[PDB]
Amino acid sequence: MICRFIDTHCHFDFPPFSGDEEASLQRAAQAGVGKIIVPATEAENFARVLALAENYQPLYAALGLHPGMLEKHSDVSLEQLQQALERRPAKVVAVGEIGLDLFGDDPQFERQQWLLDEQLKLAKRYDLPVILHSRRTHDKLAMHLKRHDLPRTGVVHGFSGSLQQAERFVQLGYKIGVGGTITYPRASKTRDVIAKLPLASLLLETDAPDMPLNGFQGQPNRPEQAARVFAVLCELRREPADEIAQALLNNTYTLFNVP
């Protein structure tokens, strides 16, 4: 098939893609990346992410407030998210890019958690899965997911961590986003985790332009690199490549309803 991969997490509204959407989508397509899910980071970017999803067939969107942009989120940002969701753009498939991140001298962790729960409530209200960011916060994030029990669950994107942390998310019904992290065998033991998880729990992604793959550092990551992440995933798994490719597509469809 021409569309063999779905990058479930690409910040396509940021540079180098902004203003170069046509060429970027063709580079993605020729690599077999046929659809891309674009999660927002803050209310000020909702319009441009919605415009991408409405104007380009391959792009789908998620709206939400990223923990990395905590300083920009106000009660007005949350009201904007709710009103946007109420109008249901349609190619909007998740409440996303929400989560926790303990990086920094003062991550304002309590406020991050309150903000995450406000958005988890919206995902429940509008019956949508969530696209989650978690950096050094897997245990805490799992504690909140277990408590709030979202019927549509979601994906913990760009996962890097222990087998127990991954399995706990999978046991709560969440998927695991597989990106550039698996191309660095000496950076963590995430490759061993991904090699062991059930195939139905995996989604493919890049988190482009961030998370450059091994051997491509120093320049922006791009969605076509999902094809390369896939090649590495095949080296880790026992299943044949065609079975893995089909599973990632089916998993993505089951979670988001993106063909």
133 labelled ligand-binding: yes
157 labelled ligand-binding: yes
Residue closer to Zn ion, measured from CB, 87 or 102: 102
If binding is defined by CB under 5 A, does position 117 make contact with Zn ion? yes
Cite the DSSP H helix spans in 172-212.
190-196
Q: With helix as H, strand as E and coil as C, how does 203-226 read?
A: EECCCECCCCCCCCCCCCCCHHHH
Residue closer to Zn ion, measured from CB, 238 or 245: 245
Lookup: tokens for 131: 């696209």
Contact by Cβ (8 Å): 17, 24: yes
Closest residue to Zn ion: CB criterion: 133
CA angle 88/247/149 to nearest 5° reads 50
If binding is defined by CB under 5 A, does position 228 make contact with Zn ion? no
In the complex, the smallest distance separating the C-beta of residue 256 from Zn ion, rounded to whole angstroms, is 15
In the complex, the smallest distance separating the C-beta of residue 158 from Zn ion, rounded to whole angstroms, is 5
If binding is defined by CB under 5 A, does position 133 make contact with Zn ion? yes
The site that binds Zn ion (CB under 5 A) totals a number of residues, namely 5
Element at 202 (helix H, strand E): strand 202-204
Lookup: tokens for 247: 């599973």
Lookup: tokens for 253: 């469809």
118 labelled ligand-binding: no
In the complex, the smallest distance separating the C-beta of residue 96 from Zn ion, rounded to whole angstroms, is 9
For CA atoms 213, 216, 217, 218, give the dihedral sign. Answer: negative
- Span near Zn ion by CB under 5 A; candidates 22-30, 51-59, 113-121, 189-197: 113-121
If binding is defined by CB under 5 A, does position 1 make contact with Zn ion? yes
Distance between CA atoms of residues 185 and 233, nearest Å: 12
73 labelled ligand-binding: no
If binding is defined by CB under 5 A, does position 91 make contact with Zn ion? no
For CA atoms 166, 169, 173, 176, give the dihedral sign. Answer: negative
- Span near Zn ion by CB under 5 A; candidates 54-62, 110-118, 162-170, 244-252: 110-118
Under the rule (CB under 5 A), what is the footprint of Zn ion? 1, 117, 133, 144, 207
Q: Write out the binding residues.
A: 9, 11, 97, 133, 157, 207
Residues making up the annotated binding site for a divalent metal cation are 9, 11, 97, 133, 157, 207
